PDB file of N, CA and C in Angstrom:
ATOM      1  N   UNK A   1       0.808  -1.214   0.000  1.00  0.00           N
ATOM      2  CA  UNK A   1       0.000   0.000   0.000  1.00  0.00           C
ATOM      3  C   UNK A   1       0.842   1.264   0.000  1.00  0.00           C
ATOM      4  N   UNK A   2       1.855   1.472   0.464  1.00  0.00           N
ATOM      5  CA  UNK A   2       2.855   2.230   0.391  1.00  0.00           C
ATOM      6  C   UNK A   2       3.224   2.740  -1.333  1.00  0.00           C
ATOM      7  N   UNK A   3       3.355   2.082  -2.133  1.00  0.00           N
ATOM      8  CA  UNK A   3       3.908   1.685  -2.890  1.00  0.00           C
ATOM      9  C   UNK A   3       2.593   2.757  -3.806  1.00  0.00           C
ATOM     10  N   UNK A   4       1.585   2.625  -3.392  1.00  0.00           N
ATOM     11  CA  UNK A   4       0.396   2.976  -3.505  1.00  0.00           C
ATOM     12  C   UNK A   4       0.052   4.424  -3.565  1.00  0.00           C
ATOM     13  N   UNK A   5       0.923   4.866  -2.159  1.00  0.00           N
ATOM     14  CA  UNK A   5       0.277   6.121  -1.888  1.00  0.00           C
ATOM     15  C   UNK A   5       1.403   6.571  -2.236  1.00  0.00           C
ATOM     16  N   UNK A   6       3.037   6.267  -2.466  1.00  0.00           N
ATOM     17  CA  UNK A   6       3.791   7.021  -3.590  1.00  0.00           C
ATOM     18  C   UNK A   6       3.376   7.499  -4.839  1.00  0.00           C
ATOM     19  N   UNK A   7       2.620   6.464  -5.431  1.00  0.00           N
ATOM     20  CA  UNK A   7       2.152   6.430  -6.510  1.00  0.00           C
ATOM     21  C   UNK A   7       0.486   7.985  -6.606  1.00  0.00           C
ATOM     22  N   UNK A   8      -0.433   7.833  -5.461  1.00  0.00           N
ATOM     23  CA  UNK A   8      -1.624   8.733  -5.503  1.00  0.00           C
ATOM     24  C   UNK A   8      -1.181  10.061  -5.240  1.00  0.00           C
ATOM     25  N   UNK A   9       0.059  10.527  -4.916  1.00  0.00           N
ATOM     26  CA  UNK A   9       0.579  12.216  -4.401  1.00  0.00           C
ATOM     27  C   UNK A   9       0.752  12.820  -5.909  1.00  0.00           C
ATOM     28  N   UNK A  10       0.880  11.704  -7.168  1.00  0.00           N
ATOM     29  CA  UNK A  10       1.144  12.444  -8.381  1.00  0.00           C
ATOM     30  C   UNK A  10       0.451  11.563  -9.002  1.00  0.00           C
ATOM     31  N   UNK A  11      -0.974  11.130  -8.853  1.00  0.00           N
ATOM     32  CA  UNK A  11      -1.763  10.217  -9.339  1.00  0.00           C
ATOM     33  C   UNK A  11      -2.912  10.670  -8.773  1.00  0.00           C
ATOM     34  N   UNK A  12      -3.742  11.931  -9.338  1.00  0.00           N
ATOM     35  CA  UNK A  12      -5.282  12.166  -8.838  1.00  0.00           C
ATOM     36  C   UNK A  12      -6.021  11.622  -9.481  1.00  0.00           C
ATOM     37  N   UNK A  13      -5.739  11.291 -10.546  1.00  0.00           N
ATOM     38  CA  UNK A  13      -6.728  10.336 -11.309  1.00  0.00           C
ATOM     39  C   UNK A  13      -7.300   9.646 -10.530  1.00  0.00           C
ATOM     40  N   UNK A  14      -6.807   8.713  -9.761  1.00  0.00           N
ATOM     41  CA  UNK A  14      -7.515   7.357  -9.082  1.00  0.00           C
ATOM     42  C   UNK A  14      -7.558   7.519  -7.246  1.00  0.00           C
ATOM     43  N   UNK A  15      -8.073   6.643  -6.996  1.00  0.00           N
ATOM     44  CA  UNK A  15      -8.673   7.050  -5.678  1.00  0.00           C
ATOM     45  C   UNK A  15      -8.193   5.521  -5.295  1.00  0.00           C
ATOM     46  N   UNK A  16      -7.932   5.302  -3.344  1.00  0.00           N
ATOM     47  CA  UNK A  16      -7.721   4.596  -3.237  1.00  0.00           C
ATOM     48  C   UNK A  16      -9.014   4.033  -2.131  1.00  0.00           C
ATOM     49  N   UNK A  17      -9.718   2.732  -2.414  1.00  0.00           N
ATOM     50  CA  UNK A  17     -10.656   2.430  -1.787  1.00  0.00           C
ATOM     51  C   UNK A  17     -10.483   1.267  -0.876  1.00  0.00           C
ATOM     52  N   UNK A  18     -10.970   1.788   0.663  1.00  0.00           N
ATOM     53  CA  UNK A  18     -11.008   1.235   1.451  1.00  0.00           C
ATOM     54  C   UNK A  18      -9.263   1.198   2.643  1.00  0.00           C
ATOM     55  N   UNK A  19      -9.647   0.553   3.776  1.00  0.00           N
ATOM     56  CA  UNK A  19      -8.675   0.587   4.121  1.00  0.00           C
ATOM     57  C   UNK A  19      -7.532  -0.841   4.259  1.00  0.00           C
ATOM     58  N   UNK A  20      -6.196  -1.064   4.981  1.00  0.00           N
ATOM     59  CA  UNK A  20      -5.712  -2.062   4.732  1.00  0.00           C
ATOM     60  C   UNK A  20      -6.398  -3.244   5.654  1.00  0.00           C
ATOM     61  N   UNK A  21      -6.154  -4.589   4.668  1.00  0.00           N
ATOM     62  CA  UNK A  21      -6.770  -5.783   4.858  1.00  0.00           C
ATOM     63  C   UNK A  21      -6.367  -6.131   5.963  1.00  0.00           C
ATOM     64  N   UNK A  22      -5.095  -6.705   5.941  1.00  0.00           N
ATOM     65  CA  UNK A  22      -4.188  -7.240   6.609  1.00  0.00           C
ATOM     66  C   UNK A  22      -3.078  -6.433   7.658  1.00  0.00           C
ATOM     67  N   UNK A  23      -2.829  -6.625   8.523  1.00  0.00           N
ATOM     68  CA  UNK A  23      -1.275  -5.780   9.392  1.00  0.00           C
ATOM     69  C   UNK A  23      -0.312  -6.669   9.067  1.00  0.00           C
ATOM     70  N   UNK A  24       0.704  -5.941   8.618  1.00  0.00           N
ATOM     71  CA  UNK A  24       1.937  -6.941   7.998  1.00  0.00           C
ATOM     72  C   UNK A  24       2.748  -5.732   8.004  1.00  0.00           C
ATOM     73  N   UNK A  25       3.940  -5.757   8.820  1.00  0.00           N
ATOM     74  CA  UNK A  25       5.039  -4.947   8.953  1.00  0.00           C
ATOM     75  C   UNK A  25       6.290  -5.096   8.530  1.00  0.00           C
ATOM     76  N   UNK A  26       7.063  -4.340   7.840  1.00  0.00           N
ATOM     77  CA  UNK A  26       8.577  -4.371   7.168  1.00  0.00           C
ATOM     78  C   UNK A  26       9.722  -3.391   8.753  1.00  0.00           C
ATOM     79  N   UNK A  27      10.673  -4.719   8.695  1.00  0.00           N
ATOM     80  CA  UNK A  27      11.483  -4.240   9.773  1.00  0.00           C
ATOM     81  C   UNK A  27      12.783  -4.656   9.281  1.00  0.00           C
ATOM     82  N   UNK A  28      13.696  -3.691   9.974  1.00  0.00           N
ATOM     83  CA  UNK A  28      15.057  -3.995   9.814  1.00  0.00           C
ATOM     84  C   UNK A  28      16.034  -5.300  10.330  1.00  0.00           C
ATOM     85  N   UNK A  29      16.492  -6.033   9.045  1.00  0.00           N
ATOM     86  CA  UNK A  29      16.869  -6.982   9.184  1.00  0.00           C
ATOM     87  C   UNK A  29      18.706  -7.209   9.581  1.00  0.00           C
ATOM     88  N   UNK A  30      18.747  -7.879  10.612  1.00  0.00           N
ATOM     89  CA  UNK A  30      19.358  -7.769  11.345  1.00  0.00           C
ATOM     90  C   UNK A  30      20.388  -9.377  11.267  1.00  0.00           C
ATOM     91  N   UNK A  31      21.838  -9.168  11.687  1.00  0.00           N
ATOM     92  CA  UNK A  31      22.147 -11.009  11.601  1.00  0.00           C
ATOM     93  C   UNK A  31      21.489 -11.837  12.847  1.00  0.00           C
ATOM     94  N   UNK A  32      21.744 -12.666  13.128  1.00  0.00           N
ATOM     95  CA  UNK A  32      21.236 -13.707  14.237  1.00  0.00           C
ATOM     96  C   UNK A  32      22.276 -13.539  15.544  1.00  0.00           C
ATOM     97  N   UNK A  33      21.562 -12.681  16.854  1.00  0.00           N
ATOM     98  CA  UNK A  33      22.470 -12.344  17.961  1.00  0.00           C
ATOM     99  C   UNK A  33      23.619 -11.488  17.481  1.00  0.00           C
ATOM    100  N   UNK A  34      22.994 -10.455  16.885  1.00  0.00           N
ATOM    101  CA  UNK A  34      23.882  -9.139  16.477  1.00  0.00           C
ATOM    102  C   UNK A  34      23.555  -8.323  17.701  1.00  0.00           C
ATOM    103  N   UNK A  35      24.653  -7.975  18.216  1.00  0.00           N
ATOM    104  CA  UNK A  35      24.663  -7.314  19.479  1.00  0.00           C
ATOM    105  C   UNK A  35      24.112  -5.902  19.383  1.00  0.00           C
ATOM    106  N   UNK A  36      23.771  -4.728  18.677  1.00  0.00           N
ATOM    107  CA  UNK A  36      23.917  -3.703  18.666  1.00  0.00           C
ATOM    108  C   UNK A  36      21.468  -3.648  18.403  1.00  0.00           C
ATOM    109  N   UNK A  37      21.303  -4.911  18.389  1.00  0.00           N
ATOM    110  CA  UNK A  37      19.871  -4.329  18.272  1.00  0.00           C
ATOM    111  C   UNK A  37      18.750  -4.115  18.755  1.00  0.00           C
ATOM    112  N   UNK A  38      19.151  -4.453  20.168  1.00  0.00           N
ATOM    113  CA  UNK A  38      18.701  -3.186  21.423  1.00  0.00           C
ATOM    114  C   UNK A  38      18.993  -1.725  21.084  1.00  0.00           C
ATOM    115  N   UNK A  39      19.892  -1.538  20.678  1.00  0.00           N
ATOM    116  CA  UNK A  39      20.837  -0.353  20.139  1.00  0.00           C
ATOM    117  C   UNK A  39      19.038   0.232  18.819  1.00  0.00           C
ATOM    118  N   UNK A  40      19.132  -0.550  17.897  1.00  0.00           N
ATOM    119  CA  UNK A  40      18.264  -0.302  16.822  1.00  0.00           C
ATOM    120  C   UNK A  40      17.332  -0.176  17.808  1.00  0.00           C
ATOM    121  N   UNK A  41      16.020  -1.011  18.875  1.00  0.00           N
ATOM    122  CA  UNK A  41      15.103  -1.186  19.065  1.00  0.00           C
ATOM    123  C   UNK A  41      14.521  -0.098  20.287  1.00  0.00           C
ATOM    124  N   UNK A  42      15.330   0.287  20.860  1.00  0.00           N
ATOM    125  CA  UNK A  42      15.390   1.749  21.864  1.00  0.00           C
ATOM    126  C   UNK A  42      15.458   2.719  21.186  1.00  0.00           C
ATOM    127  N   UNK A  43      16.367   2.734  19.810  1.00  0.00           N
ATOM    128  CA  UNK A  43      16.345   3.682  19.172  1.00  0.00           C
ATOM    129  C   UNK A  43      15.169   3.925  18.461  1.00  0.00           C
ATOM    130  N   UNK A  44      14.711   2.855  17.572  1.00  0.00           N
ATOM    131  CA  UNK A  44      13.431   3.555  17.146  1.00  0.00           C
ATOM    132  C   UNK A  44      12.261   3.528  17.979  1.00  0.00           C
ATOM    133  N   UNK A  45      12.074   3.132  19.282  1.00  0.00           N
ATOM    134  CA  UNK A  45      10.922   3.446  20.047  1.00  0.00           C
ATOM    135  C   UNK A  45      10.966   5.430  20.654  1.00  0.00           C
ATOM    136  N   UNK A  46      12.281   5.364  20.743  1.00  0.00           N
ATOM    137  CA  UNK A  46      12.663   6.687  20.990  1.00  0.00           C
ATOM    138  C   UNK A  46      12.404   7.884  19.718  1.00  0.00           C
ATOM    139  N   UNK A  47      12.528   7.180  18.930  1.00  0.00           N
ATOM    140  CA  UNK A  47      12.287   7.765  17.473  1.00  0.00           C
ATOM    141  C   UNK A  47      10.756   8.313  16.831  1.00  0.00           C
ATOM    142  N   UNK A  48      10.031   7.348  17.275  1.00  0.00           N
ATOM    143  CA  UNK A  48       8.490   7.313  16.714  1.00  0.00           C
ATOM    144  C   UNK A  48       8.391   7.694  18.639  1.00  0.00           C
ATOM    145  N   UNK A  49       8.441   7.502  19.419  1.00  0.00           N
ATOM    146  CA  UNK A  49       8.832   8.495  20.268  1.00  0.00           C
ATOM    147  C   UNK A  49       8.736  10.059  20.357  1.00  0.00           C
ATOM    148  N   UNK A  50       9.377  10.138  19.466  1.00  0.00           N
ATOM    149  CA  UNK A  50       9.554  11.550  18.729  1.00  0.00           C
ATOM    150  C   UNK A  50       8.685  11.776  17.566  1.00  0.00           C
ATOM    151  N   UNK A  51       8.007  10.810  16.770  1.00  0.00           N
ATOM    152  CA  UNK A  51       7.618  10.970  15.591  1.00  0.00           C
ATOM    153  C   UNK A  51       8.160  11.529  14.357  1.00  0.00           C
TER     154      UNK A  51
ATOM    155  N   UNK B   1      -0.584  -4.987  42.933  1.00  0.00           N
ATOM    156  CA  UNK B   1      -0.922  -3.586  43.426  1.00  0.00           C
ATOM    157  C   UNK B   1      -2.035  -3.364  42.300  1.00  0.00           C
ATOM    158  N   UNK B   2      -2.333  -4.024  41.276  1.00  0.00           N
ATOM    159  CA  UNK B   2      -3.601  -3.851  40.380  1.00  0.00           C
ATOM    160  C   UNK B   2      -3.435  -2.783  39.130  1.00  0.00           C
ATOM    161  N   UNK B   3      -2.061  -2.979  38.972  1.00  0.00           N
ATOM    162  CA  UNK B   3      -1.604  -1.982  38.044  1.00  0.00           C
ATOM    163  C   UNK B   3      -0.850  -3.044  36.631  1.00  0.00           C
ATOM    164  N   UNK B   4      -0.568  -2.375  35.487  1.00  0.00           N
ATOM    165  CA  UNK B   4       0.844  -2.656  34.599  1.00  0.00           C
ATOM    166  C   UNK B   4       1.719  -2.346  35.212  1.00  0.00           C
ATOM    167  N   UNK B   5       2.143  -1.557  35.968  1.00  0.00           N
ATOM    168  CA  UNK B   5       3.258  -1.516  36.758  1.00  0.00           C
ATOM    169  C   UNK B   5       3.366   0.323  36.619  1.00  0.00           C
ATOM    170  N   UNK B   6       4.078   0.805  37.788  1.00  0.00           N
ATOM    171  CA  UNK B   6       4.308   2.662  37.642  1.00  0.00           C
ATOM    172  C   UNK B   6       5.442   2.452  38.214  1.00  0.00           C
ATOM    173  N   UNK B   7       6.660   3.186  37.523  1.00  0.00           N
ATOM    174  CA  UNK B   7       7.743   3.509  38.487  1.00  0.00           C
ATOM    175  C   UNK B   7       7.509   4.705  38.919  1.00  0.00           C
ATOM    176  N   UNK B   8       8.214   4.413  40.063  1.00  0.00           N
ATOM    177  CA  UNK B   8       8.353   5.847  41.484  1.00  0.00           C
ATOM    178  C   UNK B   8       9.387   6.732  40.540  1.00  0.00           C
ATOM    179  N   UNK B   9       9.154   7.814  40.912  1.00  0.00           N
ATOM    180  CA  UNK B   9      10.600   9.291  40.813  1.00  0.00           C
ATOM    181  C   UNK B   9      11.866   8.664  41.626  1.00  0.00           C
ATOM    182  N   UNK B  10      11.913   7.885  42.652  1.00  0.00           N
ATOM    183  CA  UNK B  10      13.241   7.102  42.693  1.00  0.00           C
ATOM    184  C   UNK B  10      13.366   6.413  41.521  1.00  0.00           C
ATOM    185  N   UNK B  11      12.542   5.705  41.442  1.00  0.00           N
ATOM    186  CA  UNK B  11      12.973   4.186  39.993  1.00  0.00           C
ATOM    187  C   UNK B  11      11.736   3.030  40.626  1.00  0.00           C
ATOM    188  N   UNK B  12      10.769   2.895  41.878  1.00  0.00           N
ATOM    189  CA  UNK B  12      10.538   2.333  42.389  1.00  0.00           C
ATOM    190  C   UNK B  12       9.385   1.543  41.448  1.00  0.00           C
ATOM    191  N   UNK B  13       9.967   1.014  40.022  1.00  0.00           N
ATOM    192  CA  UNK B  13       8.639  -0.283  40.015  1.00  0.00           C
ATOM    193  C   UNK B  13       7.925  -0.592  40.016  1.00  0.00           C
ATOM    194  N   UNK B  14       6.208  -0.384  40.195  1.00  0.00           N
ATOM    195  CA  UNK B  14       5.386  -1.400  40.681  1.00  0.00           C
ATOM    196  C   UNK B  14       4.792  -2.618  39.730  1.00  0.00           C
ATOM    197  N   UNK B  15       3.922  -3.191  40.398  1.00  0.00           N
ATOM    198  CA  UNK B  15       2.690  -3.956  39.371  1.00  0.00           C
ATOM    199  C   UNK B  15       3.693  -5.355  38.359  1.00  0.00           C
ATOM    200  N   UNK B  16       3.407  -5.783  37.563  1.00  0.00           N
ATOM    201  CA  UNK B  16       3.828  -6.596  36.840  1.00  0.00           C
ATOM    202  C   UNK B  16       5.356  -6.378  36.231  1.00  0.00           C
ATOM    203  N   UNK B  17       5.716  -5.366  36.106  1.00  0.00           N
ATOM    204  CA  UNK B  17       7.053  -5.013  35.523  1.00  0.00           C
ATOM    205  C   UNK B  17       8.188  -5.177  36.828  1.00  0.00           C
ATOM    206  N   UNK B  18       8.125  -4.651  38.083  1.00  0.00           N
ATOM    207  CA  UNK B  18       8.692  -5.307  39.360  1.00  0.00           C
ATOM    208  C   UNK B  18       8.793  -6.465  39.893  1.00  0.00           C
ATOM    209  N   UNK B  19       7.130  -7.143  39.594  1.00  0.00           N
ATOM    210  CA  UNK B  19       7.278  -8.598  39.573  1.00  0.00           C
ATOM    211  C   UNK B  19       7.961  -9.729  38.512  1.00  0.00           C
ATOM    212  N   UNK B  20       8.144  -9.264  37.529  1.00  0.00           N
ATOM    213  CA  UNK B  20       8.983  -9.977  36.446  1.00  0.00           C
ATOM    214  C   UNK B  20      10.477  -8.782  36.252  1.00  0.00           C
ATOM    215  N   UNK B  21      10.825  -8.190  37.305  1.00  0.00           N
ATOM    216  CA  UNK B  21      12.431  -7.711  37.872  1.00  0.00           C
ATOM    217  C   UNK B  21      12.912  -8.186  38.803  1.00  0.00           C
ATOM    218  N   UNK B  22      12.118  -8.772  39.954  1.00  0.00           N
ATOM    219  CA  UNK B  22      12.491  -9.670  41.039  1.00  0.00           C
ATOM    220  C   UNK B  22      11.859 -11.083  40.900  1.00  0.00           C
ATOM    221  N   UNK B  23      11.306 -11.393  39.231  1.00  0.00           N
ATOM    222  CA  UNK B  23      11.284 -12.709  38.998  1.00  0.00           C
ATOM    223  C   UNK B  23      10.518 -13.775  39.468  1.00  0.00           C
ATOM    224  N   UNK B  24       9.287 -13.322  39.898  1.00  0.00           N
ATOM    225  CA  UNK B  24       8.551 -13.579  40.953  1.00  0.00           C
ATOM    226  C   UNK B  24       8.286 -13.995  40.132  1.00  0.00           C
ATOM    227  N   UNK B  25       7.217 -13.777  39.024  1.00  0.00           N
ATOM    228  CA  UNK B  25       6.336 -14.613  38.034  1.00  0.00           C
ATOM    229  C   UNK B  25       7.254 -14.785  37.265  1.00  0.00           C
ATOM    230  N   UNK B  26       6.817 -16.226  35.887  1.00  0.00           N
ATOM    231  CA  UNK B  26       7.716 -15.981  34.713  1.00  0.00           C
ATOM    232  C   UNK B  26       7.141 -15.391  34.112  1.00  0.00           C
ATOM    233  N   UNK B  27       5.997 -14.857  33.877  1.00  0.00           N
ATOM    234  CA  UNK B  27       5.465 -14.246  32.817  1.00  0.00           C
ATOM    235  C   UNK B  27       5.059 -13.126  33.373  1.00  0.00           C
ATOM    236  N   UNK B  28       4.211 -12.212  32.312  1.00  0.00           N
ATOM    237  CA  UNK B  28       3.296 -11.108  32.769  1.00  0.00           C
ATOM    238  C   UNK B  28       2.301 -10.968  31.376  1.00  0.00           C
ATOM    239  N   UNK B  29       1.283 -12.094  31.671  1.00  0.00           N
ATOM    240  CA  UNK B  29       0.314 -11.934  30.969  1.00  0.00           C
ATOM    241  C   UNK B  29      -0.903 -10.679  30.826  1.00  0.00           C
ATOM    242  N   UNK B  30      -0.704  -9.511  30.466  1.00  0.00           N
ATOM    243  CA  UNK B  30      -1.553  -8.812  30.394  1.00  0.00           C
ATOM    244  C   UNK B  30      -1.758  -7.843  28.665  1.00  0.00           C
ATOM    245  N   UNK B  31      -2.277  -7.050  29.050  1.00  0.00           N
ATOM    246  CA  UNK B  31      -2.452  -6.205  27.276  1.00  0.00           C
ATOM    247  C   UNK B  31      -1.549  -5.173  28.049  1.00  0.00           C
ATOM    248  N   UNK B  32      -0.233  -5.497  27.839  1.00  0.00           N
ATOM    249  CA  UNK B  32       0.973  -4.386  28.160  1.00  0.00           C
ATOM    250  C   UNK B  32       0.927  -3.444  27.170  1.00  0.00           C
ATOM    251  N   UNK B  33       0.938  -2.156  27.442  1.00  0.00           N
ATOM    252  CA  UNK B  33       1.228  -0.941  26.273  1.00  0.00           C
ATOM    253  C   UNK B  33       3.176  -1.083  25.880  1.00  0.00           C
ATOM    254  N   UNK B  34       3.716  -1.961  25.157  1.00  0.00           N
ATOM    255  CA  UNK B  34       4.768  -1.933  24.799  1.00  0.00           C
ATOM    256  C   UNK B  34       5.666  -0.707  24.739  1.00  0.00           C
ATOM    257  N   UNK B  35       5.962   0.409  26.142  1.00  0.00           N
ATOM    258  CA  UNK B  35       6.748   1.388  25.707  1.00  0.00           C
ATOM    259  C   UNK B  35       7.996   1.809  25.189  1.00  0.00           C
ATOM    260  N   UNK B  36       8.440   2.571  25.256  1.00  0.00           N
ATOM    261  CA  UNK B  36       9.518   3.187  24.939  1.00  0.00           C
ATOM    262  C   UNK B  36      11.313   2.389  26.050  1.00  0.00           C
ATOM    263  N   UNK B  37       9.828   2.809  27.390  1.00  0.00           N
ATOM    264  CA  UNK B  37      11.624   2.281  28.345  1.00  0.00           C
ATOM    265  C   UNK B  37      10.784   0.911  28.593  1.00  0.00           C
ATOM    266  N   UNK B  38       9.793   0.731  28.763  1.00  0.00           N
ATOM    267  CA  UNK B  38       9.394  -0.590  29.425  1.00  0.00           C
ATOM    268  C   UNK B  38      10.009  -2.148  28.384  1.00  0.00           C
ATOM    269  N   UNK B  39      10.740  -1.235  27.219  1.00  0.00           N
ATOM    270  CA  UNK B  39      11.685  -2.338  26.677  1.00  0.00           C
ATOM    271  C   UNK B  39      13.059  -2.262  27.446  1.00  0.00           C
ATOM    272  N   UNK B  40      13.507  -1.186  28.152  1.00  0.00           N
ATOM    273  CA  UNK B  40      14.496  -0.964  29.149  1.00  0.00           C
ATOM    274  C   UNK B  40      14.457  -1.611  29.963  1.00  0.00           C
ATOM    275  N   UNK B  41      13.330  -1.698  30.580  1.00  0.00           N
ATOM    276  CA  UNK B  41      12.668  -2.400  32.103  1.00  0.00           C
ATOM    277  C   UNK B  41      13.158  -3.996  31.543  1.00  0.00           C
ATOM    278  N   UNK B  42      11.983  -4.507  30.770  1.00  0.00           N
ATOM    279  CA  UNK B  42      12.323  -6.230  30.483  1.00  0.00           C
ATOM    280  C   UNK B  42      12.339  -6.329  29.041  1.00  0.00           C
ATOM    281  N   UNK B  43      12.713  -7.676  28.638  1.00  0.00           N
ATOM    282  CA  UNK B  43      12.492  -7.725  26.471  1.00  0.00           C
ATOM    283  C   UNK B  43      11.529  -8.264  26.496  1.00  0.00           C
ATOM    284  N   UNK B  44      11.049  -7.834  25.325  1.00  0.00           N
ATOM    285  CA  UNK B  44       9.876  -8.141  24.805  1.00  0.00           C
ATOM    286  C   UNK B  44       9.763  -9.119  23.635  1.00  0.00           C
ATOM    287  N   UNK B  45       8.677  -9.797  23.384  1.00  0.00           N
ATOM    288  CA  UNK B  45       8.629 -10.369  22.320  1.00  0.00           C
ATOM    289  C   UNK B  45       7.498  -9.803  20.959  1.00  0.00           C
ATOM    290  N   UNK B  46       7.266  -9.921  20.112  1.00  0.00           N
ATOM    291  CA  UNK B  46       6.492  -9.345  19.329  1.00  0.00           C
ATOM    292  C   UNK B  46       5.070  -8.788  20.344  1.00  0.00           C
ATOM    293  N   UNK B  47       4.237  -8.083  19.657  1.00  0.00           N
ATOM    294  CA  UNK B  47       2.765  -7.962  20.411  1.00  0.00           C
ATOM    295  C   UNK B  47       2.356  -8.690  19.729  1.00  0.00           C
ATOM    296  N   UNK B  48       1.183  -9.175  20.670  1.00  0.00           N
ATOM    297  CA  UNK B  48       0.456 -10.393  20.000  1.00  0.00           C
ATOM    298  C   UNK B  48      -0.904  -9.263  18.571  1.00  0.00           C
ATOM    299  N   UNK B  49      -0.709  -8.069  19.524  1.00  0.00           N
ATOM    300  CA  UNK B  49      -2.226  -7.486  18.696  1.00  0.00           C
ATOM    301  C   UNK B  49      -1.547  -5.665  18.737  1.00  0.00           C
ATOM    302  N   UNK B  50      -1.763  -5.288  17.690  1.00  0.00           N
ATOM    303  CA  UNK B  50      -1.343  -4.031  17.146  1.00  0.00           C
ATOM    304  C   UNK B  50      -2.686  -3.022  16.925  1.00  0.00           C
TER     305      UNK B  50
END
């Protein structure tokens, strides 16, 4: 849907109907017991935090 | 104490987040508001509901 509303800011033609179906989130991918992503996960609570 | 837990202006804890710091329960089954420090306090695992 993202992908979507890049697309409708220079796309008035079309309208987008309804809202999203599903919750399905894109997150930063990280290695397995990478130490620093507490580091990432404080940070972005602090972040959107901030907004 | 019938709370999610409040820390004191010392640091003082209460409710479910004190009790899973002194380990009392293993869990803390409730609809926790996932905050900012209360990932400071203990880790979390995904929310079950967004």
């Amino acid at each position: 849907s993202t992908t979507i509303e890049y697309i409708t800011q220079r796309n008035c033609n079309l309208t987008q109907i309804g809202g999203l179906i599903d919750s399905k989130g894109y997150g930063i991918g990280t290695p397995m017991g990478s130490p620093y992503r507490d580091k990432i996960t404080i940070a972005i609570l602090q972040l959107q935090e901030e907004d | 104490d019938g709370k999610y837990g409040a820390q004191d202006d010392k640091g003082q804890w209460n409710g479910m987040v004190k009790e899973l710091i002194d380990h009392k329960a293993d869990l803390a089954v409730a609809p926790l508001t996932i905050t900012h420090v209360r990932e400071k306090a203990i880790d979390f695992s995904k929310p079950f509901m967004t």
